[model samples]
Structures are given as structure tokens and as C-alpha cells.
Target: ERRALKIGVNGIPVTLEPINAISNVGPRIVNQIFDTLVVRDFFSNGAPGNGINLMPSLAESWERIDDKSVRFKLRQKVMFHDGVEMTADDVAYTFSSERLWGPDAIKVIPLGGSYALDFDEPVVEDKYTVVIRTKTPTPLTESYMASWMGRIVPKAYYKTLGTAAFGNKPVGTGPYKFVEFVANDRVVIEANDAYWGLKPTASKITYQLVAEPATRVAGLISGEYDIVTTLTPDDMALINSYPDLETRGNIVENFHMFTFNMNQPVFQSKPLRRALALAVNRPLIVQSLWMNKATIPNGFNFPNYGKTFDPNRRAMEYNIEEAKRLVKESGYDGTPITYHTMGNYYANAVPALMMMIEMWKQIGVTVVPKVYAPGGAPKDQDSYMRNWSNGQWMTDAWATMICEFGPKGQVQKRWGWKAPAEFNDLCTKVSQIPDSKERFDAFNRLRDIFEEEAPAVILYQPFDVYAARKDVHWRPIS
Candidate 1:
């Protein structure tokens, strides 16, 4: 048996550059060619799955020496795809430089999450040992290291090849080695015989870019593709109808929301923001757009976060009269506000936008819709629909707050919106607290401020639908 798997997806990667992969497609491809320091342990949550807790990968073990420092013990005799032995020097170089790991300036997007550490240059203690020192004790250090974002790469190999050439023939220590990539077509990788972990079961894995949903379905049915992803809820029924096909839909923390430019004169008023949030028929959107397949956010928190999620927190409600009242209170002269958006990133984005426009019009609000190319953004956008997640299984409320509203959060840094000092200061204070109760108290203060400030509207969590051939016995353990 060849033991090969072929998957059809939405887009083929243009470059194999994992560092700058901001889209879902990039990470999907990059992960195959790279190995992070640790692997996520899903079974840790008392569930038999992956992507939840930290497990060892390249670095066999790690130890926190003190509040400000940690040490990683590299796996012995690990072989890169290019036939070079991995050492502490490679790990140190990948994360040590300001050019790579600097807060604002990073060449590649860290897959797990951004390094929350107050990073300084790491020291190579020995051939297989590296000590990472930071200014503050990052409680999330072990988590981040285990995250997909901390994928380690060969230093000498990358530096020698540089960006263009390296991306063309990237080398890493993973289960698979790059075979070939045809732009907008497909990418193929072969299993590495010398992999330190259990060698890949599939001898070869071919990832093909199949943009059309119908085409992907046909390919899977015809046996040209063994697996397919980026599926819609409507497609799951069709897939399951086939005898040899199965479907799985898991809800992660990923969500879509309307982000207002606080600097924009139209949305500067908190009342106006609140009105916009209230005007939307969330239940209708969820039912119509998602076929009731999505989660209506109770607050800013997801229920999976457990105890830390604020049960008392108030998210926007669907009260047309309250929306109208808030609109009246805003005292607007019915000036048309331009809304920038993209189509099809989520299910029925265009339809959802149209629905929102129609509803907003009922409250005497004039909205001008501007559709951009997929994944496009305007230099000046009054408001736009975007997606994000706090990326935690167990609710680390303070961490979520910092990732969303702190200086490094989407509000202040990613979206370039101004953050309130109280919010920012409270986030800082929350991080320093040792007790979870104290952390929860700070989060309560933060959520109250969120309702009052309306920095970004928390809409709903999305469903991650996937389809696979029933005959394929593989499960995602990475």
C-alpha cells in the first residue's frame, strides 16, 4: 500500500513562507513542512482530541529555571529535511533576533500566537540546550512554546538561502518533507523516514487547491481527492449522503464581528456604536446565514472557556425599538456612512451585509456598502467585518483581555484604534495577579468597560465544518 492522502482545499499557497502566512491557507500548508517545539495535547481537557494542551516535539523537555528564564532540551539526533542535525543554535537564531521576534516587526506570523514573553536575545547554553530570558514571567510561556506558532526552523539553511530561495525550497524537521508545489494547483510532501516521532502513516500527502465547492465535492466523490476542507453547513448533508464519506464540525473560538473605526467621526460616539450593534438581528443572521449552525455569543466569552467566562456580561441584544431610541439619542443628521466589506470569507457575508443594511435603514440609518476584492481592505474604513479569537481552551480571562484589548491586542495594535487607559491599565494589572479570582474580578471590570466603551462588537462564534472520506482512518492529532 502506498499510504497516500489527497486533500482538496480552497486555495493553493503562493509561497511556502510560514512566517508571513496570515490566511488560513498558509498555516494549513506551512505546518506540514515545519515542526514546532511542542505539540498540542487535546486529551488533556478530559477529551480524546488534539490542539488543546502542550506535548513535546522538537524540544523533548523544557524547564522554567526562574520567573524570568526557561530552558529547552532539544531532541537528540534530529534530522532536518536537508540532512542537517538540529541544534540549540538553530532554535536560538530563529527566536533570538529583533528582526525576527520583535513585538512590532516580525518577518513571519507566529503560528501558535505571538510570543507573550518580554523577549530578549536567547543564549545557547550548549549544543542541545537553549536558555530563553525575558523581562517578565510569562505565565503562558509553556503554552506558547507548545503552540503551532513556535515552529522551529534551521538557521544556517534559511540564512544561506534567504527569503525567496528559502521559501521555494524550505527545510524543516517534521513528519513530511516538501515534494513539489504548483502555484494555484497543488502541493505534495513525502513522509520523512528519519522523523523522531512516529513516522507519518501516509507515505505521501497531496494538498490540492479546489476553489469551487461543487468541484471539491465532485473530486472527493470521484476518488480524485481523499479529503476536503473549508466546507459549509449545507455541504455536510450532501457529503454524508455518500456511502464512503463522513463529516466533522468542531467549534473553535474563531468569530466574525463588525469593527468600527473609533477615530471615524460617524462612529466616534459610543451610543452610535451601541446602536449599530443592537440594530442587527443576530438570531436571524445565525439562522439564515448559518442555518442555526452557529453559536450566538452570550457575551465576549465562549462557553468552552469554563469558569472564567462572564455569565453576567451583557452582549448586544436584538431590540429594534432600543436601537431606534439609541439612534435618536445619537443625534445624527442621517449622513451616509461607508461600510467596507468582503464577500464569502464566511458563509453569506454579502447576504449578511445586505440584511444588516436593510435592518439599519429601518432605524433611519443610511449605510453605503463598498465591496472589495476578497481579503481586501481600504486605507480608510469607517467600519468593516473581521474575525478573531482569544485562542484558549480553558478561559484565561486576563490573557484573552490582553490579546483583544491590550496594547498588543487587535483594538490598539492590529486595527490601530485607540484604547482607553483604564482598559489598558486594567489588562496590565490583571496579568500581574496570581489568583484566578483576582483575575476574574479584573475581567469583570474590563467587560463592564467593554459594554460602556464598545471598542469592538462581539457578534457570534463560527462552526468549523470539514469533510473527509469515511474510508480514511486518519485523525488530526497535531
Candidate 2:
């Protein structure tokens, strides 16, 4: 008898198109359907430098041809879900400028563009060999290639179906083949027997959309769902109470933060921004809401960065008196600043927001909450509460810091914050620097400037909790 693993999630992906899919749910499906040139060895112990080990995927072997280019030899006879043979042309087309980075790009994906800034259209040398060229010396090219944004697509199939039709009926070279995708309902995929890697244990996987936490829990108890994602801290006791069920969680390579729109007049004042940063009681929030399961990161950097992670660094202190003093120093008028958030998309987000609002009130700042549907927040919102993850799963600043705050990163692209010229210059230098210590120092300097500017507040590192039946054998990844 064939087995089907049904996973209940809080939200569904907005788009099935790999390049255009930006929501958190998108990668959960995209990773199953598509394959990247390289991948992080999640099962392996940490590498020598505390970095995640990289293993070949579509590309069997690769070598650094020069400071600016890398040549990849694709695995022979690999077949896509549609039964078409994947070649260098497909890999080239997947990262082409027309689809990813050029002015006339099909669609500018914010997440892809940030990592692909230095990448040029890959030159297809032969049937199974391609050379990836970068404008600058990028040491993290392999790291970037292993990320979710570097998924390879079938050029021939994509052109034949076009964007709209392709998204509806996607084809890839992963362990799973797309069966059906019902928007806001479920996405179904079956095992790809032709997969070159380890075969999936389950015959079919269904990611069912269940927005309500209570409903998802009930469904899990009723055996309607084999597993459920995005569980809150309060859900631990109840889920563990059942003999057949267990809850597993980890502090993933992601952090919840609030980015202030620099375009807004109220947020432009450094003293005001500092006051806002100082007012938040992060430890209390972690204790009360998370039950002390989550931890507060020093800044944008994380311990996952391995040798680059600085243990001595500390985040801003919680000082209400200092925040009040700074608020007065900025001469801020009694303006009700708008705080935008996706309601309950992040576990216990609404309650956390309410707590933050109350904390700000203690410092004489008025914060008005504006909750929007998932992926529906306005571009000009004063502040945004969101979680940013290190999809590369590597021990490098490029995976998180560079992708979020560097030049061509989310700070400028999504948050509308124009970073200073000094910061941009340092970002370029850090990207090109090959020495680990040099790059670490450069990153520290960047963090210093970022902290002084107070463009955003690093709230805490979040723990991703999932409830699953004990019979199901699987472990969560960071």
C-alpha cells in the first residue's frame, strides 16, 4: 500500500512560479519540486570552519576557474519531471539575466536579485558544462548557488508553457513531481521515481492549508494530518499530552525584526529610532510569549555564521528612561506611527505586537497597528514586522547580513532605506574579501554603523515548532 504524508500549514504559497515565489511557504514546496546546482549537507556534522558542508546536486563537480568565474560539470542523464534530459542550457537559462537580474528581466524577484547581483548570465560551454561568471570576485558563489533562490528550471518546458501555464503545471528534477496546486487549499506532489538522489519514503505529499491553529491541532489529533507546521509556544503542552503525538522545535537560521521605512519623516530621526530600539523589552517578550524557548540574537549576525559569529557583541539594552530621554531629544511631535504586520502569520505575532505597542506607550510614543493579509502589506508602511531567514544555511555573513542589508539588499529594495555610501563601499569590500578574519572585521564595522543608524530593530531569533505523529520519521532543519 502506498503512503501519503499530509502536512497542515498555516499559509499557502502566493505563487507557484519559482522565481516569483517570495513568501515563507513558497520554499517549503519549491525545494521539493526543484533542484539547485549545489546543496548544503544538512545531515553532516559541521565542516572545519563551522560552515555547512556543500554537496553536488545537479552539478556533479565544480572548480573555481578564476577569481571571477566557476565552471560546473552537470551530472549526465539526469531527467526532469517531464522526462526531458536536463543539460547545461537548462542551468544557464535558470540563472539568465533576462529571468533574474537585467533591466528587461521577466520579473525582478527581490530575494533572487539580492544574491544574484554579481552573477552574470552563465555561459553554456557544452551539453553538460557551464561557467558561472560574476562581475566581482565573489567567494560565496557556491553558497549562493546552494540557496533556494538558485533553483534550476527546464528552459524548453518553461518556454513551451510560458510563465502562467508553467506556474500552473511546473516541472523540475527533484524527488517530487507536481500533481496539483489548488490556491489557498492544498498542493499535492508525488514521488519522482527517476530522481537521482535518495528516494522519498512516502509515495505522495500533500501540503494542506489550515490557517486556524486550533483547527490544525484538532485535525492532527483526528489523524487527518500526519504533520502540522507553524505551531505556537502554547501549543506544546496540548500536543505532547497525546500519546501518539509529539512536538519538535528548533531555533532556525531566521530572526523576527521590525524595519523602519526611512522615507517616513518620523522614522528619519536617529534619536527617535534609538529610542524605539531601547524601549522594547525583548527578554520579557521571549519569556512571556515564547515561554523562554526563543533567544535574542546580538544583532543581525547569528551563531550559525560559525567563525564569523562574534560572541562578545551585545544588542541594545532595554532602558525606558533612556528611551524617554532620547524621544525628547529628537523633538518628536505626538504622531501616531503606523506599524504594519501580517496578522498571525508569525506565531503569537499579534500578542507580541500588542506587547511592543504597550512598551512604546511607556516611552510616550504612540504606535497604531495595521494588520494586513499575508503578503498584502503596503509598500509605504511606516514599519514592518517580518521574519528573515538564512536560506543558504551557511556560516557566512553573506547568507543573512549581506542578503538583507548590503547593497542591492532588502534594506534598499523593500524597506526603501537608502544606505550611506560608506556602508555600500564596505559591503562591496566584504563581498570580495577572501580572508575570513578580514571579512569578519568588515562585517562587525557594518553592524556598528547599522546599530548607530538604527534602521531596524533585531527583536529575537524565532523557534520553528512543528507537531507530528510519532510514527512519522523526520527531523527539522535549521
Candidate 3:
């Protein structure tokens, strides 16, 4: 016999599709039900879970055979939830299946993030051995499966079940097995009795989506959930007030920002993007709204990202006059710029977004607010408030450089502001370069283009706050 647990989160994952890497809570769910080849064992700044270590999970050990390739030796006796044993073919298929989607990647390889795409193919040496060859040399290639991408899926099972059925109940070599997933409500998973690693204590786990902050707090207090994520700065007191509850907190690496749809006619103007960046007071947003719980970002890269990060850089100068001047210079047609958001997608995003509209008003640019359905995209939005951060697993500046500003672009779609040929070439080159110093310089050049292009205007890095029942004894890995 074992205890069942329920946890509440602020938002629902984008899809149950584990490998689909467009970004969201999907990877979090994936981590519970699937095992990655390698694991990232730390929170931001290498504090909570463990340091920035690329520890092994499914792949017991790995070696670099050449500049462009790595060989992984799979652990034997690892059983999939469907009673099948995991093998190199499954590992090869998981990485190879992504190519099936071709260049339209955000759908197929959602959490491929920055580095997964660097690989050309996964060559199976034998039943237990697999080799990953990159298009070019990439040193941290193993980190792909460390947290998000590259979890081996059953090849023969997927081919038999088909996409729709496969998505309904995917098989994996994880600590937990897929039970049921009800969209926007909950995901049900149970512990794998035949797990190769240490057996999970919980018999079953349910991830409930409680979009409202108050609702989440209430559910936690009412004993509906064992743990609840996203306990905002405002809710910290209320949570601590309860004798049976406590909070686990950290300053995670995520940044909340609004991304411009460069394809839109109004946003095509560079000055308009710059003016909006200047108009919003980032420090003010962090102060009044976040209660100074968040760090105001200096640039696109997070502060902990070592040399690739520039502490001096700002997307644009925060000057009111300059903002107005830029707006004027851009040939202002009085079109109301719509700021879009999915309610509570990132906690405090809606509030921060509304605050931006008020700030932009001072610069004589008319702005409108639009809230899409919970987890739905805006029908016609000029720009949208979105969150960007390094997952605990892939915590490096190179990941940010490649994912956010690469040719595919993380935010909207293809040709994000149409990055220069130089920018695109450098991104490709940087991905292949293993040396941190060389990658840092390459990223710095990309940052130069990012500042000038202004595809997205970053706001601030919010605190990673979550609450749990006193006796639950759980720590958030990411």
C-alpha cells in the first residue's frame, strides 16, 4: 500500500506530447513519467536539488568518440511501462522520430530547446549501445536529455499504436507510468513497480491545473492537494499562516517578457519596438508588482549564465523622452497596439502586462489589452507577454542564444524579425563550438544583433515560488 498525492500548478502544460519542445509545463510532466538519458540535478544557480551536474539516468555512461559524436551505453533491465525493455533502438528512434516533422519543429520537438537539434542522427551500434553524431562538434550534447528533451520512447509500440493513440497513453522507462490525462484538469500517473531505479514512495500522483492563485491556495488548505506550485509573493504570508503548510522558495532563472510579432505590419518598425521597451519601467514592475521578489534583467541572458551574459546591456534605454521621440520618428499611425496574454500562464504576467499599457500611454502610443483563453493563443495580437528561462537541466547561455534567437526562433515563428545572415551563421557555428570562451564570444555577437533587432523585450526574472503540505516533504527539481 502507498499514499496518493495531488499537486496544483498555475497553468496546464501545452500538450501531453513529451518530446514536443515549444516550451511550457509539459517537460515537468514528462520528467515524472519518462526518464531522460542524462539528468540535470540543480535549480537556478546550482542551489536546491544539486549543482549544475549532468548526471546519468537511463544512459549509465557516455564517451566522446570524435569531435562530432558521442557513444552512450544503455543500462540493462530497464523496463518500459508497457512491459517492454528499453534498448538502443528506442533511444535512436526517440531522437530520430523528431526529424519526421522536418523543419516545422516547434510541434514535433517542443522541448528540444537549444541543443537537441545539433545532432544529425543517432546511430545504433548494437542492442545496448547507441552513438549520437552532431552535424558539428557540440561538447554538451549529453545535456539534451538531461532535463527536457531526448527521453527514449518505445519505437515498435509507437509505430503500432499511431499518433492519436500513442499520445493518449505513452509508454516510457520512467519511475511513473501513464494512467490518464484529462486536458486542462489533471494528469494521473502511478509509480512503476518494476522501475530500475529506487522505487517511488507515492502509489499515484495527480497534477491538477488550478489557474487562479486563490483557488490553488484554497485547495492546498482544504487538503485537496499535497503540494501547490506558484505561491506568489503576495500569498507567502497566507501559506505560512497555516500551521499545516510551508513554502519552498528560490529565485529561479525565468524571465517574463513580451514578444513582438514582427510579421505584423505595426511591429515591423524597429523604433516602435525600442519605444515600447523604453516606456515600460522594469524596476518599477519588479518593485510595485513583484514586491521586489524578482530581479530586473540587464539583458536577454540570465545573470548566472557566466561570461556570455552582459550585465551592462539593456534591450533599450529606459527614457521617456527618447521613447516618445522614437515613437514619433516611427511615423505614428494611431493604431492601438494590443498586448496579449494567457491568464496566469506565468504568475503576475497579466498584472505586468496591464501595467505596460499604462506606461506606454505616457509615450503617446495607444495600447490595448487582450487576454486569450487559458492556454490559448491570441487571435490577432501585436505582441504577447511570455516567460523565458533556462530549465534546471539546460542552464547555460548557449541554450538561450540558440533557442531564443536562432533561425527558427522560440517566440513567434519562422523569420523572427528575419535575423541577419551573420546572426544565423554565428548561431549555427556557436552550437557546434565546444569551447566556452569561443561560444561566449559567438553569443556576444548574437546579443549585439538581438539588441538591435529587438525581437522580444525582456521584463524581469520572477521568483520560483511553490507551497506544499508540511508533511509532504517534496522539493521542486526545476
Q: Write the per-residue lDDT of candidate 1 for residues 1-478, one digit (tens) a residue.
A: 5568988876665577556543556667778788878777768868645436677788889998987788999898999998999999988876765435564344344321333456678889899999877766655566666544466778898877764577778788888899998866778889888888886878888888776667877888899988887666777888899889988886656566766766666666677777777788888877886778887766666654555677766655677888889889989779887766644444455667788889889988887777664335566453543432344423356445566567665566655556678888887787776547877777778777776666666657766677788878873312
Return whichever of 1 and 3 wins on lDDT.
3
Best by lDDT: 2
RMSD of each: 3.5, 2.9, 2.9
TM-score, one value per model: 0.85, 0.90, 0.90
| Backbone clash pairs in model 1 (N, Cα, C under 3 Å; residues 3+ apart or in different chains), count | 6
Candidate 3 lDDT, 1-478, residue by residue in tens: 4678888876666555575523456766777778878776666454665456677888899998987788999999899998998999888877773533245443545434343655676899999999988776656676666646666778889767754467677788888888888876778888898999988888888888888878998998999988888767888888999999988776776666676777777677578887887787888888887778887665766655655666666554578988899888998788777766667768787788778888988899887777666546754343432334444235467666576567655543542476678988997787666557678777777877776667777677778678888888643323
Worst 10 residues of 1 by lDDT: 106-115
Off by over 4 Å in 3: 43-50, 97-107, 110-115, 162-165, 310-316, 380-395, 410-412, 432-438, 475-478
lDDT of each: 0.70, 0.78, 0.72
Global lDDT of model 1? 0.70
Candidate 2 vs 3: which has more lDDT: 2
TM-score of 3: 0.90
Candidates sorted on lDDT, descending: 2, 3, 1
Tens-place lDDT per residue, model 2, 1-478, is: 4578899887777767786664567788878888999987776784432346789999999999988899999999989998999999998888887667765553535466665648877999999999988888767677778876778889998877766678888899988899998987789999899998888767988998887788889999999999998887789899999999999887766677776777676766568887888899998899998989887877767777776788888775778888999989898887788777666667767788899999999999988888777557576653533433333245577666677777777677766667778888988887777757788888898888788777778788777789999998852211
Q: Tell me the RMSD of model 3 versus the true structure.
A: 2.9
